[PDB]
Amino acid sequence: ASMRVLLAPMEGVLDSLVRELLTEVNDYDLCITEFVRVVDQLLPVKVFHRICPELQNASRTPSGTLVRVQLLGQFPQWLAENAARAVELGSWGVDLNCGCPSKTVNGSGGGATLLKDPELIYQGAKAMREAVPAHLPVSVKVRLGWDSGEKKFEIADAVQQAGATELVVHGRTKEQGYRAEHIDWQAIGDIRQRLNIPVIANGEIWDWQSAQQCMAISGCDAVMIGRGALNIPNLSRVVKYNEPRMPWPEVVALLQKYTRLEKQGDTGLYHVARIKQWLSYLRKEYDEATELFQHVRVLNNSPDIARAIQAIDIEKL
Numbered sequence: 001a002s003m004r005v006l007l008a009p010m011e012g013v014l015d016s017l018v019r020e021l022l023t024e025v026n027d028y029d030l031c032i033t034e035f036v037r038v039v040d041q042l043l044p045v046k047v048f049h050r051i052c053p054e055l056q057n058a059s060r061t062p063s064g065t066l067v068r069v070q071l072l073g074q075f076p077q078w079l080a081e082n083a084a085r086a087v088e089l090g091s092w093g094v095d096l097n098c099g100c101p102s103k104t105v106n107g108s109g110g111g112a113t114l115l116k117d118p119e120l121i122y123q124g125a126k127a128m129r130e131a132v133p134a135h136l137p138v139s140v141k142v143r144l145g146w147d148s149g150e151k152k153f154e155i156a157d158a159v160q161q162a163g164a165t166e167l168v169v170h171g172r173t174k175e176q177g178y179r180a181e182h183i184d185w186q187a188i189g190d191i192r193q194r195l196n197i198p199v200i201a202n203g204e205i206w207d208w209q210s211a212q213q214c215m216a217i218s219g220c221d222a223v224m225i226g227r228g229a230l231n232i233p234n235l236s237r238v239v240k241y242n243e244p245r246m247p248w249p250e251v252v253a254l255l256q257k258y259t260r261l262e263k264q265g266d267t268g269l270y271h272v273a274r275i276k277q278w279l280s281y282l283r284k285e286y287d288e289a290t291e292l293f294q295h296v297r298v299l300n301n302s303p304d305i306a307r308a309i310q311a312i313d314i315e316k317l
């Protein structure tokens with residue numbers, strides 16, 4: 001019966017602005033921030049506030065949905081220091097990225113690179129668990145492996161043995177990328193059966209039926225949705241309650257609200273890039289988004305795209 005739905009971390013997509021917009025019209029149980037890249041220093045407080053403005057609102061979006069800071073990096077001492085800082089600043093626990101393809105800085109790997117030696121996941125997660133007060137959660141997000149799923153149980157074991165609270169599994173290897181035909185929710189179930197912490201299933205959940213299938217196959221009562229949450233802006237309610245997808249006119253209203261939200265540190269091109277990007281996702285689902293994208297793709301500045309989006313009369317749609 002009960003179902004948890006998490007909004008995925010998405011670097012360069014799901015910032016605080018889009019989290020604000022989406023959580024207002026959804027029932028997400030938790031959102032994950034874009035990653036804070038940890039190398040070999042304690043990051044200043046402003047980095048956390050930039051990535052997670054919700055820290056100044058008791059770790060919640062304006063509508064009240066919890067948000068959790070994610071770290072990306074390798075060195076245990078520095079993951080620990082930065083985890084402690086995230087929670088000192090108010091984060092509801094802390095998450096560790098072990099699934100994103102990521103550039104190594106000097107000797108400091110991160111993300112999917114850690115899947116090549118599961119011990120790196122154990123050491124990083126353990127140092128975070130030890131640094132974060134015991135009542136607050138420490139989560140880890142993984143893929144099934146690097147170039148195969150052969151180490152998928154070692155990866156899962158590393159997270160549990162580190163004392164992590166919960167595990168998100170993206171049901172593909174790194175080398176399988178985002179290829180739909182390679183999703184393996186069964187592998188997620190096999191991991192769940194071995195563990196004693198909640199497993200949150202992730203990958204290729206787009207609608208009510210796909211979530212039902214995912215839960216049935218994996219045995220997980222918790223899922224995480226990333227790209228689908230942009231394609232269908234009310235996807236949490238689609239998945240939880242089998243409600244219809246957000247009508248297009250309400251999608252346009254959402255885009256209009258986005259054009260009126262200010263972005264901290266914006267040089268001037270934020271809305272141009274981000275409205276085009278969101279439309280590039282929406283065209284997978286909404287015919288109308290393909291047409292609107294053709295109209296706005298030629299605009300090269302935020303005021304022009306703001307005027308264009310705002311000009312649309314949603315009562316005429």
Ligand SMILES: Cc1cc2nc3c(=O)[nH]c(=O)nc-3n(C[C@H](O)[C@H](O)[C@H](O)COP(=O)(O)O)c2cc1C
Pocket residue numbers: 008009010011012013033034035070097098099100141170202203204205224225226227228
């Ligand atoms: C543009 C983009 C950025 C992402 N950034 C992150 C990130 O910052 N941290 C992370 O752990 N995963 C990141 N991911 C992976 C997603 O959280 C998620 O695991 C993936 O998109 C698969 O789920 P989906 O099929 O529901 O999209 C990103 C994915 C995309 C497409």
